[PDB]
Motif scaffolding. Structure first.
Motif, PDB file in Angstrom:
ATOM      1  N   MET A   1       5.218   1.648  10.487  1.00 11.54           N
ATOM      2  CA  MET A   1       5.232   1.715   9.025  1.00 11.54           C
ATOM      3  C   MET A   1       4.192   2.675   8.467  1.00 11.54           C
ATOM      4  O   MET A   1       4.320   3.124   7.320  1.00 11.54           O
ATOM      5  N   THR A   2       3.140   2.957   9.223  1.00 12.25           N
ATOM      6  CA  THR A   2       2.123   3.901   8.770  1.00 12.25           C
ATOM      7  C   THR A   2       2.362   5.290   9.363  1.00 12.25           C
ATOM      8  O   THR A   2       1.457   5.947   9.884  1.00 12.25           O
ATOM      9  N   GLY A   3       3.607   5.757   9.273  1.00  9.50           N
ATOM     10  CA  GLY A   3       3.986   7.054   9.796  1.00  9.50           C
ATOM     11  C   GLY A   3       4.034   7.061  11.311  1.00  9.50           C
ATOM     12  O   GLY A   3       3.148   7.622  11.957  1.00  9.50           O
TER      13      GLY A   3
ATOM     14  N   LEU B   1       0.830  -1.201   0.000  1.00  7.47           N
ATOM     15  CA  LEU B   1       0.000   0.000   0.000  1.00  7.47           C
ATOM     16  C   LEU B   1       0.863   1.249   0.000  1.00  7.47           C
ATOM     17  O   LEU B   1       0.646   2.166  -0.794  1.00  7.47           O
ATOM     18  N   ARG B   2       1.852   1.299   0.852  1.00 11.21           N
ATOM     19  CA  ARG B   2       2.668   2.501   0.852  1.00 11.21           C
ATOM     20  C   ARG B   2       3.543   2.628  -0.417  1.00 11.21           C
ATOM     21  O   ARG B   2       4.456   3.484  -0.394  1.00 11.21           O
ATOM     22  N   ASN B   3       3.326   1.832  -1.475  1.00 11.55           N
ATOM     23  CA  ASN B   3       4.082   2.011  -2.716  1.00 11.55           C
ATOM     24  C   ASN B   3       3.234   2.076  -3.982  1.00 11.55           C
ATOM     25  O   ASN B   3       3.665   2.646  -4.994  1.00 11.55           O
TER      26      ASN B   3
ATOM     27  N   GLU C   1      -3.569   7.245  -0.666  1.00 11.30           N
ATOM     28  CA  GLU C   1      -4.784   7.173   0.186  1.00 11.30           C
ATOM     29  C   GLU C   1      -4.525   6.696   1.602  1.00 11.30           C
ATOM     30  O   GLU C   1      -5.164   5.741   1.974  1.00 11.30           O
ATOM     31  N   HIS C   2      -3.886   7.513   2.431  1.00 11.93           N
ATOM     32  CA  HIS C   2      -3.572   7.063   3.809  1.00 11.93           C
ATOM     33  C   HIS C   2      -4.830   6.727   4.602  1.00 11.93           C
ATOM     34  O   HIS C   2      -4.737   5.854   5.421  1.00 11.93           O
ATOM     35  N   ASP C   3      -5.946   7.417   4.404  1.00 15.67           N
ATOM     36  CA  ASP C   3      -7.185   7.067   5.154  1.00 15.67           C
ATOM     37  C   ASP C   3      -7.678   5.670   4.783  1.00 15.67           C
ATOM     38  O   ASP C   3      -8.349   5.067   5.597  1.00 15.67           O
ATOM     39  N   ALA C   4      -7.501   5.230   3.550  1.00 18.08           N
ATOM     40  CA  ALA C   4      -7.923   3.842   3.274  1.00 18.08           C
ATOM     41  C   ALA C   4      -7.075   2.861   4.086  1.00 18.08           C
ATOM     42  O   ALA C   4      -7.634   1.969   4.667  1.00 18.08           O
ATOM     43  N   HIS C   5      -5.777   3.111   4.216  1.00 16.34           N
ATOM     44  CA  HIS C   5      -4.851   2.167   4.877  1.00 16.34           C
ATOM     45  C   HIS C   5      -5.246   1.849   6.308  1.00 16.34           C
ATOM     46  O   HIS C   5      -5.260   0.662   6.623  1.00 16.34           O
ATOM     47  N   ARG C   6      -5.583   2.854   7.106  1.00 19.32           N
ATOM     48  CA  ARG C   6      -5.854   2.596   8.540  1.00 19.32           C
ATOM     49  C   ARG C   6      -7.003   1.608   8.594  1.00 19.32           C
ATOM     50  O   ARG C   6      -6.885   0.638   9.315  1.00 19.32           O
TER      51      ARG C   6
HETATM   52 ZN   LIG Z   1       0.346   4.065   5.194  1.00 18.09          ZN
END
Ligand SMILES: [Zn+2]
Ligand SMILES: [Zn+2]
Ligand SMILES: [Zn+2]
Ligand SMILES: [Zn+2]
Ligand SMILES: [Zn+2]
Ligand SMILES: [Zn+2]
Ligand SMILES: [Zn+2]
Ligand SMILES: [Zn+2]
Ligand SMILES: [Zn+2]
Ligand SMILES: [Zn+2]
Ligand SMILES: [Zn+2]
Ligand SMILES: [Zn+2]
Ligand SMILES: [Zn+2]
Lengths: 263, 267, 267, 267, 267
Positions: C265-267, C79-81, C86-91
């Motif tokens: 990994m998600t900031g 996802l991070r690549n 779309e960071h909101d989708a990731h959480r």
């Molecule tokens: Zn992320």
């Protein structure tokens, strides 16, 4: 060398009879019980050690089998996706054959130049030999041909993928063989146990004689054979690449791949 | 260390012989047969223990081999798919080398920072040391390189997936080493057995002294050499990411990886 | 441990042997070592081959949870690549991945995970989760619903979508691994019976030894009993990997390392 | 088997030893049982391991020949799921696949595939095949040439083509494995020379048991021998997986299972 | 049925305690030393044999565990890629569940028709039953549904390939089971060893009596129990697809997979 140490056991038995009727006279006693404890421990440890060495050889033979499988499917795939690009056939086939022979020389610490000049042009031979790992280079070159077909638009990214994956099989193979040849996993102890067994086999008479007398050698040479035959197996399995006629037949395998790929 | 006990053994043998006359009087009979039962026990057990230690060491060697393999083909795939983009070749190769060295330093319990900054800029070195999973961060950045090249349209989703796979291979390798060091969970037995095998090898002469008398030491030392040499076999293989001699040649390996990828790139 | 009871027991029983070597020829009880060496070596052979499988499956559980960490780590990297945006989708994804971990740990320790989904997921999904027979399977179907929503959006091609789904397989397979090892009722077909067999063996051993050893019986009997009972406990440990004992795996620390990995990994 | 021959020999040897115990102290020379326990146990260990090798060889051989059925089954499935009405390809590919199977049987028994080849294919390509270095490999090539013939004509994309080409890989890796077990067996050596050491150990054995066993020597020295002679004959039955014997793998039966399967899949 | 052997063994101890007399006659003595060689040998041989049997059993287990995983995630993929096409889902789930039953009915040589008609439309049941290999026929029919989604544009070659690959986890399972079910391997050495253990036990007291006297029916039942336990361990693992109580439940397994596949379709 087993018959030497066998018929040296015969000696040490004759010694253990012409020097038996003196033990209490000057000291010393000897009983079967310690030497069968020792003997059973040695028999257990040999089995485990050999189990390793067998493993090494089995793994080596599997690596070299994958050489043959991968290099066959890559040429099949060229002939089936680019059925009509035979000037690329030859270039790729020869890089593959180059790679096989070049690996053999890597494992044997021998000069691959000779073999390279027969399959490839000298402009390639020098580039290859210049590398810290010429095998890896020959793979890089195979990948080149395969990807120039991609930029030529003759191969989709899909079919490029199919074939590239075989260079992957070939790399996983190169790394394997480097692992087994560069890193022996504690093979020094094979010397140790060797020593141990021999020591055991030359004492057994002096311990058996009390129970066996004139039969001492007949028994003490049977037993040692059964032990020397087992340790010997570790010697004929632990060097899958070496010069010895039992070791993997790499020259013959390479000839097999070259004959296959020619078409 | 072993030869200390091979000498201590002869101490226990002569101590047994001198200690023999007071045996009958003091009320101590000792017979080989229980000690054969014990020895054959201990020996079996060591075979299985050893068997496991060896498997662990093979996993570590196989896992490191996978580094060398996966990075070699990842580079190769760059130079075959994007042969005219060596601005990315440099950055990706430098992340890959930094992955190897970061790992080596993880498993050696040392500061990974020197090799790290020799091959990277400071701007990311921070973000890596500032993570609690540095070797995993390096993979995040190395993937970020390929994602870049894909947004750029210079990699299709096919050719990007190809390199993403080899990143996945490296991720498995990292999880592997992590697990293998990722505690020696209650394997206290390798200690226990060793403590056992010492005791055995020291009590053995006091059982052998009747049936052997002035022969006792040489026999016992022999057996103590045989049981010890095999036992210490599973001290070596048990630590595979160590500073030892027969241990893994990690430093040499990473060097081979750097020379490999630099030489593949043309540097 | 529970063995340091058994050791004291053994010493007691060999005392019983010495005080009751008298009523021997009278009551007609003759007991010799040589049949008990057969029993002991037979047993040791069997323990080796039993421990062998035990270590195999404990190792398998280790490798399964490690695989959980790896797969989720990479799904996050992917996802991070491919969707750096779309960071909101990731959480909502990382929340399902952590939900999956804890739901596994509670699926195995056989406990109620409801007080744990509420920390990760809104409550409309929670009753949907508990509603289904297997809630880890459900968390997977949901994270799959996320990746596949991104697919229908056009934010992922079928290629990149594939790349991500494969890791929900690297995960389903770990699920079906821990299950097969749990419902595997621990093949104690020989294990409880071997433990029993070794106990009886260890308490008898002095009676077969005293005829030959006299006052030395308890010493040799406890060395042998220890050597057998220590190799035997090696199975009480490696057979409940989803338990709570100091040997059984630390599943809470493992889930937590998963979490701090994904969060980091998600900031 | 002809094992009851060596059992017979042990009876007869027991009679000789039974009526030779008198002569034995010809030179006060005896044959105790203790050393033959050493030798017998050691042999038993070694039979364990050796057999382990033999078995592994056999099981693998069995596995690869199973994979054949598996991969051809899927390849015909995809030919019916993806090109559900090509038919011309439906027969042509299946003939090349059956021909692969039968021709692999012939390859491992070093026998004559001309007959089955002609049975399944036109001689127009029976000759293309028989004149090849490894006719199995030419046959894989022809199958590919049919799948590429279908991609060229656009009836398969590069994706579905790729699907099927993975299966011709599954088959290539089968051929490779068999060819390795047959062309490159690991040192056969020790196997035969154990059968010697075991045999001898049987015959020499009663000469040592008689001193303990009197007129019981025949009935026991046989029992023991049977045990050993049975375990040892495992190597024979499990080292010629491709050969001809009742105890070997019924390759003909397997090739008719495969052919029956694929003809079932194409009506 | 083991306790039969234990009781019978107690009987033959008693017989040994009385008929020991007439052993003076001619010379029919039975020592412990030969049976200790034979018992140790039999322990070894049992070890390696059970080793092989265990391995075969685990492989059966994991084959089934993959039926569970593969079908689970084929369903999930169907949902996250084609969430609107329930009328397809109910069909493909019918074919997956039907595969499980037809597989078990295959490995039990029991008739499948009762389950097939319960799960599948008459005109498909007739075809599946008309095949000589119905489990494969089911995998094929599960193929035509997916391949018709592709033929309808509802699936692209990439997603199709992502499902097709699960029909392969399955095909690989059906092959593995079939091969596990055409055994016995040697044609039944493990029977031979069973008899060998029965004889060893129910001759053992005759050899212990000269030494243990009354303690004979006790040491002997202990020894017989140890060997008979470890050996009865195999008859359980050797038939993993069996009706007996130690074998895999299967019907339980087939249920768990069915409910798992219905609790993923809102049914
Ligand atoms: Zn992320
Ligand atoms: Zn050509
Ligand atoms: Zn480059
Ligand atoms: Zn630039
Ligand atoms: Zn630092
Ligand atoms: Zn790879
Ligand atoms: Zn991964
Ligand atoms: Zn899967
Ligand atoms: Zn057709
Ligand atoms: Zn391949
Ligand atoms: Zn006698
Ligand atoms: Zn649905
Ligand atoms: Zn497949």
């Amino acid at each position: 060398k087993i018959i030497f140490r066998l018929l040296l056991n015969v000696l040490m038995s004759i010694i253990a009879i012409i020097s038996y009727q003196w033990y209490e006279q000057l000291g010393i006693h000897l009983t079967v019980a310690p030497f069968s404890l020792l003997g059973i421990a040695i028999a257990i440890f040999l089995g485990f050690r050999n189990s390793a060495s067998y493993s090494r050889f089995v793994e080596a033979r599997n690596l070299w089998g994958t050489v043959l499988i991968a290099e066959r499917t890559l040429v099949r795939q060229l002939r089936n996706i680019l059925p009509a690009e035979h000037d690329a056939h030859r270039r790729i086939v020869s890089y593959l054959v180059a790679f096989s022979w070049s690996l053999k020389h890597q494992l044997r610490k021998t000069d691959p130049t000779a073999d390279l000049r027969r399959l490839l042009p000298e402009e390639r031979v020098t580039e290859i030999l210049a590398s810290s790992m010429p095998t890896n280079r020959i793979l890089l070159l195979a990948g080149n041909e395969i990807g120039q077909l991609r930029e030529a638009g003759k191969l989709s990214d899909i079919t490029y993928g199919l074939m590239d994956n075989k260079l992957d099989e070939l790399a996983h193979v190169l790394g394997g063989c480097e692992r087994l040849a560069t890193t022996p996993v504690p093979f020094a102890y094979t010397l140790i146990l060797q020593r141990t067994v021999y020591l055991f086999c030359t004492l057994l008479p002096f311990a058996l004689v009390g129970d066996l007398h004139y039969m001492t050698p007949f028994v003490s040479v049977f037993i040692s054979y059964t032990f020397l035959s087992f340790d010997s197996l570790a010697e004929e399995l632990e060097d899958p690449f070496g010069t010895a006629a039992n070791d993997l037949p790499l020259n013959a395998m390479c000839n097999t791949i070259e004959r296959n790929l020619l078409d």
